[PDB]
Task: structure prediction
Amino acid sequence: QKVDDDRKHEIEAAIVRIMKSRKKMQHNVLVAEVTQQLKARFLPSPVVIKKRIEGLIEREYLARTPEDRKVYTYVA
Amino acid sequence: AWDIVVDNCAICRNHIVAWGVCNHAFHFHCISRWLKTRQVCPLDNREWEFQK
Amino acid sequence: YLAKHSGRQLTLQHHMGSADLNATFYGPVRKHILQVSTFQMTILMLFNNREKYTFEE
Result:
């Protein structure tokens, strides 16, 4: 569990970078991309996949987009 | 144990062998804060991605 | 070497200190190096040093 939690940030970093490079997609598309990115590293539940994407702003690396409840945009 | 002075690791205000990616003896929060602007760590001239 | 190379991750395992010491026994009533851990070798050496052993020792 600790290894999965540690690798969650690394897996979600790529998703956050892709979202920042795109900044325009469906609300569920952002969650699906995050789930697919973390599928290769481990097998997280959909709630865990959503939490990993939502915690990107809390990682002290980028920010989030409060306008969309599901789509997240990373400033950096 | 690493002779890197565990009393002060970096600018994190969270206190502090273990092998990482920059070998700068920095906490997880400090590494993330540093990577918020530049991913390159200015301590080993190599790409840093953190570990453990 | 550790003092000269400050901040270098070149060290051995403290909890798994490898050593092969020839413990001295009371003899028959031959001798070979016994593989023991760093922390658990003291009690083994004390028990093999004499015949009488106790928890307080």
